[PDB]
Ligand binder design. Structure first.
Ligand SMILES: Nc1ncnc2c1ncn2[C@@H]1O[C@H](COP(=O)(O)OP(=O)(O)OP(O)(O)=S)[C@@H](O)[C@H]1O
Ligand SMILES: Nc1ncnc2c1ncn2[C@@H]1O[C@H](COP(=O)(O)OP(=O)(O)OP(O)(O)=S)[C@@H](O)[C@H]1O
Ligand SMILES: [Mg+2]
Lengths: 420, 69, 325, 373, 107
């Protein structure tokens, strides 16, 4: 509003719009929908009736994140501006305290700042007195349910008044939410509409990608060979191999069916070809191009593959000495949780069961003057280093002997990474 | 006498042989004489009265005339 | 361990209990009760005379004393002392110790307003309670000796008055000569409450009153298992008509075999059994109106997948013939 | 075709006949009967009394009887403030609305001596408020005491969901005291009083408002677990737009959303045969009925796959993604449960909605999980 | 586990050898054949066994999994899988349907 005038600055020194820059502009998650096409009507025809008849209803939609329920209901109200209402995005997680949404509503009727207490008095005074038109989105309803359900009873008791000019639209995480957190007295007020949103399917996941790739798929750029700048000296083209786009779809629809996850794995795979193109020619920052299948093979795996195995073999010696002692106790006792003094008891014993040049160094950094150490060198350090790494876990006790230690990653992969 | 045939109708309603909660009149005729109880099914009026006494006890009502809700 | 238990008792409903209880407590030993009440009436001039000496009078004894204190404090003493000093009579401030909602702040806020606000004592209001009463005490050492207030503390071993920060608060009140402290306790370990420090401030004397009263008001806050088998006895009286039938089919085969786990039924066959009488459509429609029996804790489940009712063998046939039928 | 069904979605009840007998002294200006009106939820009971008082106020003599909703208080003061709002006056409010004895001074009227009855809406928020015998039962106790000597008495009409509240009353209060007695209940109307109101709420009748025996069929086969037939007409009003969208049909559409994956669509969730293997791997770890970590499951996954060499052992990171494929369909849920060593530390315990009876059918068709069982 | 008892010892192997010798002695033979050991093992396993008292596209799936266990490539150009299906005995219509079904299953 105000400060966007101050967020603008002047000197913009000719940023290089490369080949893959114009992809990521439309591969931004912003800018009719193919997948939830008919269900857009099922909201809207449920909404169009109450709007043009001055009533008060409730609409309940659920689903996993990434399915458009943040998006679709925005497309409902957007066309409605063409044809009497006040649009508010009452987000649950964007409220600091749960009562703070009450302040917004009384702010968004006349423009007054009153307390959560004093708002809902005048809100209740609004909802049963006004002679005769308010659209409210109650997003992410896991946030506003937590304390004692006294907030959630209000947001549906206002719907019961026949003289209440309000239209509520609830969007939750799960359909189960008025059956495993709320009471039945709320569950009578929630209704039984319950519009379910499933995942996306992999065919439609192809049909959502090309909507971003509408005017740019297999099109042509105008490029100078000196700076790598592309314009919608050569006239090059860039093509997208649709089969790699398909194998992006057949995984994301399989695991999650998430519309952000499908776009972003294409977005991550796009910039892999960006740096390899910049590696071969070096246009910096101041015949026919493509994106291979081998890009989305890596980037999809790049969502999966770890490093704690590679972290463990790149740790210190006494780190790998520590874990090898720790699995030795877990196969000695079979109790998966060993006392800390017994580990210090073991690393002593695992010496005497090159080793002497180790055992000299393992308890003192040379130095005859200051040798004879009980516990090993930097034993507090590696145990602190294994703690904040998340591999280990150690309960809090002022005794430094009988404080228990519990593993936090799978002990077999600890056994397996130890073998290297 | 109707409890055993009601349990038979319920266990045949448990699968997708009716494909819904409802069932057709052809499947109604297919599940009275082709099934296990022989000569337990009398005239049309008494089994229509049996469907009516299942209906007021909320078991099997009568609707749309091509299927039976 | 074959033990006879309170579950195996002929139980009594709410209106049946309290009415016949009211018959006994107003007609059992009526003649000797007022016959005691006339005997102890002659002690009333003796209490009046000793109470001029600022003595904290304490009444022990079996039975409730609540009726006796209110006759002795209100009607007898409080106008008798006003007539003997020479106009409204002496203000009586009772303290219901059997009421657990007594605090130290609220009753003392009454006290300083019951006592004289001759100075700005709200200036010393800043825990200043012992501070504010100390400024009350030394001023009262140099005043003309006359009672202006008599307070009554019923059931001094009560659930809130027996708290230790409240007890010491009353201790400093009793050393003042202007107020007479007539209280009663009922506990058998009541003299565990006071040391020689407090009784120095108290100078208690003792008298027996045993009228074997029923303690009508003092029974109300108290509870036993008379006051669940009786809890879910009322929810079934207001539900759907189908839940009665699906509990009837539940209660039959769960009592076909105390009502323990072993008499219970598996979930699959019970779904098929309540599918047999055209009642349960499937598992979800069964379980959802079975969560309503779960939400009001009217049935249990342990592991066959055994759902069993936690009421006794005698209780379920009582639930059979009365409310289900 | 819209305007006939645009109007579709919107003395009258056979329960109002009860309460005029229960308010038999409310037109003779005397103290009426003793009103504690309860109900199972959803039964219209909030708007039921609201129907009566709005028909009372539109009918009715000086006219001032007020009703306030006990939702956002947790404390018995401002109710006695809101009865003052029908006066439109000004006073010292704080002390008069706080103590039991302070309410008694408030009950001397001014203009024409019409008696006042209060209506306490949604009393169960204060019943199911803070701890019982300390504040809330005392709050219940203090309100129901009507021992006032003139007939101007604050007659209560309070409402509650769950019917435990009467046994919660003390034995003195259950000795025929105040408004507790007439425990007027409302059994949920099956179809025999609620559907007929829908008939009279079809005063403006379109031609095709559907075969009404199917509406009777709708009423009979919803009355298993229900209380609000206009809201269960609001599920007919959604299906009446289905016949507008296509230019108990919908209850059939909504139950197949809920019943399936155990019988049929379990194999829909596990098109991967390894997803069938990893699903049995979870249940084999459920022998040690513990906090079923993603690691202890991975422990039993490796130590079995080294015995039977059905596949190579995969990654833990792969094991993370594959169990989330099991998650989004709705089979297994993951929660961050409790372990209390250093802080509130969150290891992930799973839980499966399948039984071994619904397991053994779908594994005998595949003899590659038969080594694993 | 739960239904387990004992372990395999060399004395049980010697007893199996002795029972095979007794079975050969009952047949009055100078040699021990393969028929005695398979009877003795069946005898010692049924001595403890009283305590318990198609593949239309699955064969193609095991062939595809054998090729996936030797190299592990889910390509779109099948030149060896089609040859082992042609020499395995069945037709190519079931092969094309299996390819379409597992591409729909995304393997
Ligand atoms: N059908 C679609 N057509 C076009 N863009 C889409 C579509 N579905 C999702 N998107 C895009 O992907 C983003 C995903 O956000 P949404 O799925 O709307 O949020 P969500 O499903 O509510 O997940 P939340 O908000 O965390 S519960 C949207 O903001 C759009 O930018
Ligand atoms: N018999 C009826 N006559 C008129 N309107 C009715 C009737 N039954 C239900 N309704 C309407 O449908 C609504 C459904 O009741 P609910 O308000 O959801 O439940 P309730 O009124 O809160 O009672 P509770 O749940 O015990 S607080 C009522 O509030 C009325 O608007
Ligand atoms: Mg919302």
């Amino acid at each position: 509003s105000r400060f966007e005038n101050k967020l603008k600055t002047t000197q913009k020194h000719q940023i290089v719009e490369t080949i893959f820059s114009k992809v990521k502009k439309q591969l931004n998650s912003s800018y009719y929908l193919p997948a939830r096409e008919n269900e857009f009507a099922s909201i809207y025809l449920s909404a169009y009736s109450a709007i043009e008849s001055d009533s008060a209803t409730t609409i309940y939609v659920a689903g996993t994140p990434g399915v458009g329920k943040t998006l679709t209901v925005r497309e409902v109200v957007k066309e409605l501006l063409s044809s009497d209402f006040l649009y508010v995005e009452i987000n649950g997680l964007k409220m600091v305290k749960p009562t703070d949404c009450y302040e917004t509503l009384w702010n968004k009727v006349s423009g007054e700042r009153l307390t959560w207490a004093a708002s809902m008095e005048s809100l209740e005074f609004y909802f049963k007195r006004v002679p005769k038109t308010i659209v409210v989105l109650l997003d992410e309803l896991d946030a506003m349910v937590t304390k004692s359900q006294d907030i959630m009873y209000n947001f549906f008791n206002w719907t019961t008044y026949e003289n209440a000019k309000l239209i509520v639209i609830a969007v939750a995480n799960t359909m189960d939410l008025p059956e495993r957190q709320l009471g039945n007295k709320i569950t009578s007020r929630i209704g039984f509409t319950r519009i379910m949103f499933t995942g996306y399917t992999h065919e439609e996941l192809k049909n959502i990608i090309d909507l971003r790739l509408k005017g740019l798929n297999d099109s042509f750029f105008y490029v100078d060979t000196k700076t790598g700048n592309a314009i919608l000296v050569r006239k090059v083209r860039l093509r997208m191999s649709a089969d790699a786009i398909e194998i992006a779809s057949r995984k994301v629809a399989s695991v999650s069916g998430d519309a952000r996850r499908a776009l972003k794995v294409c977005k991550r795979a796009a910039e892999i070809a960006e740096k390899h193109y910049m590696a071969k020619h070096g246009y910096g920052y101041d015949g026919v191009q493509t994106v291979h299948i081998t890009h989305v093979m890596k980037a999809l795996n790049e969502t999966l593959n770890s490093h704690v195995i590679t972290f463990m073999t790149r740790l210190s010696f006494t780190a790998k000495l520590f874990i090898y002692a720790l699995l030795n106790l877990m196969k000695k006792n079979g109790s998966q949780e060993q006392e800390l003094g017994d580990i210090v008891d073991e690393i002593k014993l695992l010496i005497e069961v090159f080793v002497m040049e180790i055992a000299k160094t393992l308890f003192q950094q040379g130095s005859d003057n200051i040798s004879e150490q009980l516990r090993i060198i930097s034993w507090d350090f590696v145990l602190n280093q294994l703690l904040d790494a998340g591999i280990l876990f150690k309960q809090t006790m002022k005794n430094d002997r009988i404080c228990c230690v519990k593993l936090n990653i799978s002990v077999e992969e600890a056994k397996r990474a130890m073998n290297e | 006498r109707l409890s055993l045939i009601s349990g038979i109708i319920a266990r045949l309603m448990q699968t997708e042989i009716f494909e819904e909660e409802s069932y057709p009149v052809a499947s109604l005729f297919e599940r009275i004489n082709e099934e296990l109880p022989e000569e337990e099914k009398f005239s049309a009026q008494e089994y229509l009265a049996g469907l009516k006494i299942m209906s007021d006890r909320n078991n099997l009502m009568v609707a749309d005339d091509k299927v039976w809700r | 361990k074959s033990r006879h238990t309170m579950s195996m008792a002929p139980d009594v409903t709410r209106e049946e209990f309290s009415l016949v209880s009211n018959f006994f407590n107003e007609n059992f030993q009526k003649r000797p009760r007022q016959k005691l009440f006339e005997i102890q009436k002659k002690m009333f001039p003796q209490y009046w005379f000793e109470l001029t000496q600022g003595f904290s009078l304490l009444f022990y004894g079996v039975g409730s004393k609540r009726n006796f204190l209110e006759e002795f404090a209100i009607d007898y003493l409080s106008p008798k002392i006003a007539y003997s000093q020479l106009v409204n009579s002496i203000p009586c401030l009772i303290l219901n110790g059997y009421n657990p909602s007594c605090n130290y702040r609220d009753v003392f806020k009454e006290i300083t307003d019951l006592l004289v606000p001759a100075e700005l004592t709200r200036s010393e209001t800043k825990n200043h309670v012992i501070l504010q009463i100390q400024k009350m005490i030394d001023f009262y050492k140099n005043q003309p000796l006359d009672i202006k207030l008599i307070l009554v503390v019923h059931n001094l071993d009560g659930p809130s008055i027996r708290k230790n920060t409240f007890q010491t608060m009353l201790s400093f009140l009793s050393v003042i000569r202007q107020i007479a402290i007539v209280a009663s306790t009922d506990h058998i370990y009541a003299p565990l409450l006071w040391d020689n420090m407090k009784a120095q401030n108290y100078n208690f004397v003792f008298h027996d009153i045993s009228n074997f009263e029923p303690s009508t008001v003092e029974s109300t806050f108290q509870d036993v298992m008379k006051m669940g088998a009786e809890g879910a006895k009322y929810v079934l009286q207001s539900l759907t008509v189908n839940s009665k039938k699906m509990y009837k089919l539940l209660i039959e085969t769960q009592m076909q075999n105390r009502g323990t786990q072993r008499t219970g039924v598996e979930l699959k066959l019970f779904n098929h059994l309540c599918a047999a009488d055209f009642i349960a459509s499937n598992e979800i429609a069964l379980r959802s109106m079975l969560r309503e029996f779960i939400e009001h804790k009217m049935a249990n489940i342990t592991k066959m997948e055994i759902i069993w009712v936690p009421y006794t063998y005698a209780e379920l046939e009582k639930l059979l013939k009365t409310v289900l039928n | 075709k819209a305007l006939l069904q645009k109007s579709s979605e919107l003395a009258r009840t056979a329960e109002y006949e009860q309460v005029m007998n229960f308010l038999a002294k409310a037109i003779s200006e005397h103290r009426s009967d003793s009103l504690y009106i309860t109900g199972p939820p959803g039964t219209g009971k909030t708007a039921q009394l609201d129907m009566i008082i709005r028909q009372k106020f539109q009918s009715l003599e000086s006219v001032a009887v007020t009703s306030i909703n006990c939702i956002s208080l947790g404390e018995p003061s401002s109710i006695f403030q809101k009865i003052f709002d029908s006066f439109q006056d000004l006073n010292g409010p704080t002390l008069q609305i706080k103590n039991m004895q302070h309410l008694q001074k408030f009950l001397e009227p001014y203009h024409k001596k019409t008696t006042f009855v209060v209506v306490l809406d949604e009393m169960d928020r204060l019943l199911h408020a803070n701890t019982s015998e300390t504040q809330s039962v005392r709050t219940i106790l203090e309100l129901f005491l009507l021992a006032k000597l003139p007939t101007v008495s604050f007659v209560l009409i309070g409402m509650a969901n769950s019917l435990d509240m009467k046994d919660r009353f003390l034995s003195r209060l259950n000795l025929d005291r105040g408004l507790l007695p007439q425990t007027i209940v409302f059994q949920p109307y099956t179809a025999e009083q609620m559907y007929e109101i829908v008939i009279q709420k079809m005063s403006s009748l379109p031609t095709i408002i559907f075969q009404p025996m199917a509406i009777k069929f709708a009423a009979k086969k919803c009355a298993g677990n229900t209380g609000d037939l206009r809201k269960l007409f609001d599920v007919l009003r959604g299906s009446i737009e289905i016949y507008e969208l296509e230019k108990l049909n919908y209850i059939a559409k909504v139950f197949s959303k809920f019943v399936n994956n155990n019988s049929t669509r379990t194999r829909i969730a596990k098109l991967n045969i390894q997803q069938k293997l990893i699903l049995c791997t979870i249940i084999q770890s459920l022998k040690l009925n513990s906090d079923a970590t993603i690691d202890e499951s991975f422990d039993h996954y490796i130590k079995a796959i080294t015995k039977t060499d059905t596949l190579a052992p995969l990654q833990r990171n792969e094991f993370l993604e594959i169990c989330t494929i099991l998650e989004t369909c709705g089979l297994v849920s993951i929660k961050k449960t409790k372990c209390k060593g250093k802080t509130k530390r969150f290891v992930d315990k799973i839980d499966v909605d399948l039984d071994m009876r619904e397991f053994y059918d779908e594994m005998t068709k595949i003899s590659i999980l038969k080594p694993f069982l | 586990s739960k239904f387990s008892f004992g372990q395999a010892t060399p004395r049980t192997l010697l007893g199996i050898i002795r029972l095979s010798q007794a079975l050969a002695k009952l047949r009055l033979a100078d040699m021990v054949d393969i028929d005695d050991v398979e009877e003795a093992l069946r005898l010692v396993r049924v001595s403890k066994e009283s305590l318990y008292q198609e593949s239309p596209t699955t064969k193609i799936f095991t062939i595809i999994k054998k090729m996936l266990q030797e190299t592990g490539k889910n390509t779109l150009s099948y030149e060896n899988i089609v040859k082992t299906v042609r020499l395995r005995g069945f037709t190519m219509l079931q092969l094309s349907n299996c390819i379409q079904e597992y591409s729909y299953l995304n393997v």
